[PDB]
Amino acid sequence: TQIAGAGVLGNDRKPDESCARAAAAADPGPPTRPAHNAAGVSPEMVQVPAEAQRIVVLSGDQLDALCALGLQSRIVAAALPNSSSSQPSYLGTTVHDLPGVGTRSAPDLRAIAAAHPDLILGSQGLTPQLYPQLAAIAPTVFTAAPGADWENNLRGVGAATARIAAVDALITGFAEHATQVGTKHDATHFQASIVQLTANTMRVYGANNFPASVLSAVGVDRPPSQRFTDKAYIEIGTTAADLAKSPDFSAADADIVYLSCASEAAAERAAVILDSDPWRKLSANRDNRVFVVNDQVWQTGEGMVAARGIVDDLRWVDAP
């Protein structure tokens, strides 16, 4: 498949192979464990079950972690993405079919209590005002905001589920894999651009965000326009009226461009943007080096499973 001559990557990925085939073994020990909350959360230490069987999950990166650990059948509910009535699909069927407990920005505490969780996982970067009320319902662990700190968030889920050694082995295995791919594809000698379309804007991502951190693990370089760290992305309007003003899209150019769509509404205008005079000026477009990628893998999942999906797409950096 393609959109306006840009080829689509990831169509052979099988979402139902995302989850580990069985639950990772807990660290040896007693039926409860001490786990640590993210910076700023009080109390620092939380007693959690070794084998939680009704987990409420409030951040997408934690859904990803639980899948990577094979714990998905223990999830009782998950907060829905803010802009969607649907759970993510890239993690497979069990996750996609999970019931909601409100949204990630506005969890429903009544619905959480009615799910009778034995463990709640959430993020200090998403609901910094909810910790005491969640902890009053069940053992609650908060990790940091999703994004560039995804490995430490996965470590936090590991401790929260008594799977410290399992997570350490996943992270070691990922680092070795990412380095192998980067070495094989000589990734340090290609600059990659990260672009996300919304319904009415183009976001150009810098060096401080989830996909940037995965590219850095592989060693893929970035164009000078994408080295900023003050915010995740810069944003340029792409409505029909905006495009008629001949905006300069050069910040999106590189040796290769990976472009995702944040929504179906964004996808419905992607071909327009890619066919526009500002986009056609880009060297990457002239050289047929623009690729459309899965937004859940690249942008909204933000855990190990998503990171593995990015690394697969990075095999194209040294392609003809």
Coordinates of C-alpha atoms in Angstrom, one line a residue:
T1 CA 0.0 0.0 0.0
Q2 CA 0.9 3.6 -0.4
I3 CA -0.3 7.2 0.2
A4 CA 0.6 9.5 -2.7
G5 CA 3.7 7.5 -3.6
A6 CA 4.9 7.1 0.0
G7 CA 5.1 3.4 0.8
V8 CA 3.5 2.0 3.9
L9 CA 5.6 0.1 6.4
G10 CA 4.3 -2.4 9.0
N11 CA 1.5 -4.1 7.0
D12 CA 3.0 -7.5 7.7
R13 CA 3.2 -6.9 11.4
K14 CA 0.9 -9.3 13.4
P15 CA -0.6 -7.5 16.4
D16 CA -1.7 -10.8 18.0
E17 CA 2.0 -11.8 18.3
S18 CA 2.8 -8.7 20.4
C19 CA 2.1 -10.4 23.8
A20 CA 4.6 -12.9 25.3
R21 CA 3.2 -16.4 24.9
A22 CA 3.0 -16.9 28.7
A23 CA 3.3 -14.8 31.8
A24 CA 6.8 -14.0 32.7
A25 CA 7.9 -15.6 36.0
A26 CA 7.8 -13.3 39.1
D27 CA 11.0 -12.8 41.0
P28 CA 11.2 -15.4 43.7
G29 CA 9.8 -14.2 47.0
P30 CA 6.7 -13.9 49.2
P31 CA 3.1 -13.0 48.2
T32 CA 3.7 -9.2 48.4
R33 CA 6.6 -6.9 47.3
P34 CA 7.7 -3.3 47.8
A35 CA 7.5 -1.2 44.7
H36 CA 8.5 2.4 44.2
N37 CA 6.5 5.3 42.8
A38 CA 7.8 7.9 40.4
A39 CA 9.4 11.1 41.6
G40 CA 7.0 13.5 43.3
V41 CA 4.6 10.8 44.4
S42 CA 3.9 10.2 48.1
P43 CA 4.3 7.7 49.6
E44 CA 7.5 6.5 47.8
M45 CA 6.9 2.8 48.6
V46 CA 3.9 0.7 47.8
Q47 CA 3.2 -2.9 48.8
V48 CA 1.9 -4.8 45.7
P49 CA 0.8 -8.4 45.1
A50 CA 3.3 -10.7 43.6
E51 CA 0.5 -12.1 41.3
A52 CA -2.0 -9.3 40.7
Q53 CA -5.1 -10.8 39.0
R54 CA -7.3 -7.7 38.4
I55 CA -5.1 -4.9 37.1
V56 CA -6.6 -1.5 36.2
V57 CA -4.2 0.2 33.7
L58 CA -4.4 4.0 33.2
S59 CA -1.4 4.7 30.8
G60 CA -0.9 3.2 27.4
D61 CA 2.8 2.4 27.9
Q62 CA 1.8 0.3 30.9
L63 CA -0.6 -1.7 28.7
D64 CA 2.4 -2.3 26.4
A65 CA 4.6 -3.4 29.4
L66 CA 2.0 -5.9 30.6
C67 CA 1.7 -7.4 27.1
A68 CA 5.5 -7.6 26.9
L69 CA 5.4 -9.5 30.2
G70 CA 2.5 -11.8 29.1
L71 CA 0.2 -10.5 31.8
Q72 CA -2.6 -9.2 29.5
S73 CA -5.2 -11.8 30.8
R74 CA -4.9 -10.2 34.2
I75 CA -6.1 -6.7 33.0
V76 CA -9.6 -5.9 34.2
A77 CA -9.9 -2.5 32.5
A78 CA -7.9 0.2 30.8
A79 CA -8.4 3.9 30.5
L80 CA -9.3 4.8 26.9
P81 CA -7.1 7.1 24.8
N82 CA -8.3 10.7 25.2
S83 CA -9.4 11.0 21.5
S84 CA -10.8 7.6 20.8
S85 CA -13.6 5.3 21.9
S86 CA -11.3 2.4 21.0
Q87 CA -8.5 0.7 22.9
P88 CA -5.2 0.4 21.0
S89 CA -5.1 -2.3 18.4
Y90 CA -1.3 -2.8 17.9
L91 CA -1.1 -5.0 21.0
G92 CA -3.6 -7.6 19.7
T93 CA -7.2 -8.7 20.5
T94 CA -7.2 -9.0 24.3
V95 CA -6.1 -5.4 24.7
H96 CA -8.3 -4.1 21.9
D97 CA -11.4 -5.7 23.6
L98 CA -10.6 -4.3 27.1
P99 CA -13.4 -2.3 28.8
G100 CA -12.8 1.3 29.7
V101 CA -12.7 3.1 33.0
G102 CA -13.0 6.6 31.6
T103 CA -10.1 8.2 29.6
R104 CA -6.4 8.5 30.4
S105 CA -6.8 12.2 31.2
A106 CA -10.1 11.7 33.2
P107 CA -10.3 8.2 34.7
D108 CA -13.6 7.3 36.3
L109 CA -13.0 6.4 39.9
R110 CA -16.5 4.9 40.4
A111 CA -15.8 2.5 37.5
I112 CA -12.3 1.7 38.8
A113 CA -13.8 0.8 42.2
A114 CA -16.5 -1.3 40.6
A115 CA -13.8 -3.3 38.8
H116 CA -12.4 -4.4 42.1
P117 CA -8.8 -4.1 41.1
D118 CA -6.0 -5.6 43.2
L119 CA -3.5 -3.3 41.5
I120 CA -3.8 0.1 39.8
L121 CA -1.1 1.4 37.4
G122 CA -1.0 5.0 36.4
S123 CA 1.2 7.9 35.5
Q124 CA 2.2 11.0 37.5
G125 CA 2.5 12.7 34.1
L126 CA -1.1 12.1 33.2
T127 CA -3.1 12.2 36.4
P128 CA -0.8 14.0 39.0
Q129 CA -3.9 14.8 41.0
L130 CA -5.4 11.3 41.4
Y131 CA -2.9 9.3 43.4
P132 CA -4.5 9.4 46.9
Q133 CA -7.9 8.5 45.6
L134 CA -6.6 5.6 43.5
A135 CA -4.4 4.3 46.4
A136 CA -7.5 4.3 48.6
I137 CA -9.1 1.8 46.2
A138 CA -6.2 -0.6 45.7
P139 CA -2.4 -0.8 45.7
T140 CA -1.4 1.9 43.2
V141 CA 1.9 2.5 41.4
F142 CA 2.6 5.6 39.4
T143 CA 5.3 5.8 36.7
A144 CA 6.6 9.0 35.0
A145 CA 5.0 10.6 32.0
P146 CA 5.1 8.3 28.9
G147 CA 7.7 9.2 26.3
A148 CA 11.5 9.4 26.2
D149 CA 11.7 7.8 29.7
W150 CA 9.9 4.7 28.5
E151 CA 12.5 2.3 29.7
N152 CA 12.3 3.5 33.3
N153 CA 8.5 3.4 33.1
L154 CA 8.8 -0.2 32.1
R155 CA 11.1 -0.8 35.0
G156 CA 8.5 0.7 37.3
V157 CA 5.8 -1.6 35.9
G158 CA 8.3 -4.5 36.5
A159 CA 8.7 -3.7 40.1
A160 CA 4.9 -3.1 40.5
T161 CA 4.2 -6.6 39.1
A162 CA 7.1 -8.4 40.9
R163 CA 8.9 -8.9 37.5
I164 CA 12.1 -7.0 38.0
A165 CA 14.4 -9.7 36.6
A166 CA 12.0 -10.3 33.6
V167 CA 12.0 -6.6 32.8
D168 CA 15.8 -6.4 33.1
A169 CA 16.1 -9.2 30.6
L170 CA 13.7 -7.5 28.2
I171 CA 15.6 -4.3 28.4
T172 CA 19.0 -6.0 27.9
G173 CA 17.6 -8.0 25.0
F174 CA 16.2 -4.8 23.4
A175 CA 19.5 -2.9 23.8
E176 CA 21.4 -5.7 22.1
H177 CA 18.8 -6.0 19.3
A178 CA 18.7 -2.2 18.7
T179 CA 22.5 -2.0 18.6
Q180 CA 22.7 -5.0 16.2
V181 CA 20.2 -3.4 13.8
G182 CA 22.0 -0.1 13.9
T183 CA 25.4 -1.7 13.3
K184 CA 24.1 -3.9 10.4
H185 CA 22.4 -0.9 8.7
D186 CA 25.2 1.6 9.6
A187 CA 22.4 3.7 11.1
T188 CA 24.7 6.5 12.3
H189 CA 25.2 7.7 8.8
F190 CA 21.6 8.3 7.9
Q191 CA 19.4 11.2 9.2
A192 CA 15.8 10.3 9.8
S193 CA 12.8 12.6 10.2
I194 CA 9.8 11.9 12.4
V195 CA 6.5 13.5 11.3
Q196 CA 3.0 13.0 12.6
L197 CA -0.1 14.4 10.8
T198 CA -3.2 15.5 12.7
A199 CA -6.5 16.5 11.0
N200 CA -5.2 20.1 10.5
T201 CA -1.5 20.2 11.3
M202 CA 1.9 18.6 10.7
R203 CA 4.0 17.8 13.8
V204 CA 7.7 17.5 13.4
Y205 CA 9.3 15.7 16.3
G206 CA 12.6 16.7 17.9
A207 CA 15.1 14.7 20.1
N208 CA 13.0 14.6 23.3
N209 CA 10.1 12.1 22.9
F210 CA 9.4 8.3 22.6
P211 CA 10.3 7.6 18.9
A212 CA 13.4 9.8 19.2
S213 CA 14.6 7.7 22.1
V214 CA 14.2 4.5 20.1
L215 CA 16.1 6.0 17.1
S216 CA 18.9 7.0 19.5
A217 CA 19.1 3.4 20.8
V218 CA 19.6 2.1 17.2
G219 CA 21.9 5.1 16.5
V220 CA 19.9 6.6 13.6
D221 CA 21.0 10.3 13.2
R222 CA 18.5 13.2 12.9
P223 CA 18.5 16.3 10.7
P224 CA 19.6 19.6 12.4
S225 CA 15.9 20.8 12.5
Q226 CA 15.0 17.8 14.8
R227 CA 17.6 18.1 17.6
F228 CA 15.5 20.4 19.8
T229 CA 14.6 19.2 23.3
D230 CA 12.3 22.0 24.8
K231 CA 9.2 20.2 23.6
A232 CA 8.3 17.0 21.8
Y233 CA 7.4 18.6 18.5
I234 CA 6.9 21.8 16.5
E235 CA 3.6 22.2 14.6
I236 CA 2.7 23.7 11.2
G237 CA -0.8 24.2 9.9
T238 CA -1.9 22.1 6.9
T239 CA -5.5 23.1 6.1
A240 CA -6.3 24.0 2.5
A241 CA -6.0 27.7 3.4
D242 CA -2.7 27.1 5.2
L243 CA -1.2 25.2 2.2
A244 CA -2.2 28.1 -0.2
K245 CA 0.2 30.3 1.7
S246 CA 3.2 28.3 0.6
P247 CA 4.5 27.3 4.0
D248 CA 8.1 26.0 4.2
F249 CA 8.1 22.4 5.2
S250 CA 11.9 22.0 5.2
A251 CA 12.0 21.1 8.9
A252 CA 10.5 17.8 8.0
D253 CA 13.2 16.9 5.4
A254 CA 16.0 14.3 6.0
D255 CA 17.5 11.3 4.3
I256 CA 14.4 9.3 5.2
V257 CA 11.0 10.5 6.5
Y258 CA 8.8 8.3 8.8
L259 CA 5.3 9.8 8.8
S260 CA 2.3 8.6 10.8
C261 CA -1.3 9.8 11.0
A262 CA -2.8 10.5 14.5
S263 CA -6.3 9.7 13.4
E264 CA -8.4 8.5 10.4
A265 CA -9.3 12.2 9.9
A266 CA -5.6 12.9 9.5
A267 CA -5.2 10.0 7.1
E268 CA -8.0 11.4 5.0
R269 CA -5.9 14.5 4.2
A270 CA -2.5 12.8 4.2
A271 CA -2.4 12.4 0.4
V272 CA -3.2 16.1 -0.1
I273 CA -0.3 17.1 2.2
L274 CA 2.1 14.7 0.5
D275 CA 1.0 16.0 -3.0
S276 CA 1.3 19.7 -2.0
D277 CA 3.9 21.9 -3.4
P278 CA 5.6 22.5 0.0
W279 CA 6.0 18.8 0.6
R280 CA 7.1 18.0 -3.0
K281 CA 10.0 20.5 -2.5
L282 CA 11.6 18.1 0.1
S283 CA 14.6 16.0 -1.0
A284 CA 13.2 13.0 0.8
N285 CA 10.1 13.2 -1.3
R286 CA 12.0 13.7 -4.5
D287 CA 14.0 10.6 -3.7
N288 CA 10.9 8.4 -2.8
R289 CA 12.2 8.1 0.8
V290 CA 9.0 9.0 2.6
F291 CA 7.3 6.1 4.4
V292 CA 4.0 6.0 6.2
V293 CA 4.1 4.2 9.6
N294 CA 1.8 3.0 12.3
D295 CA 0.9 5.8 14.7
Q296 CA 0.3 3.5 17.7
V297 CA 3.8 1.9 17.2
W298 CA 5.6 5.2 16.6
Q299 CA 3.7 7.7 18.8
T300 CA 1.0 6.6 21.2
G301 CA 2.0 3.2 22.6
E302 CA 5.3 4.2 24.0
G303 CA 6.5 0.8 25.5
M304 CA 8.7 -2.1 24.5
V305 CA 6.3 -3.6 22.0
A306 CA 6.0 -0.3 20.2
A307 CA 9.8 0.2 20.4
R308 CA 10.3 -3.2 18.7
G309 CA 7.9 -2.1 15.9
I310 CA 9.9 1.1 15.4
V311 CA 13.2 -0.8 15.1
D312 CA 11.7 -3.0 12.4
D313 CA 10.8 0.1 10.4
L314 CA 14.4 1.4 10.9
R315 CA 15.8 -1.4 8.7
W316 CA 14.9 0.9 5.8
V317 CA 17.5 3.6 6.6
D318 CA 20.2 2.1 4.3
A319 CA 17.8 0.8 1.6
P320 CA 18.6 1.6 -2.1

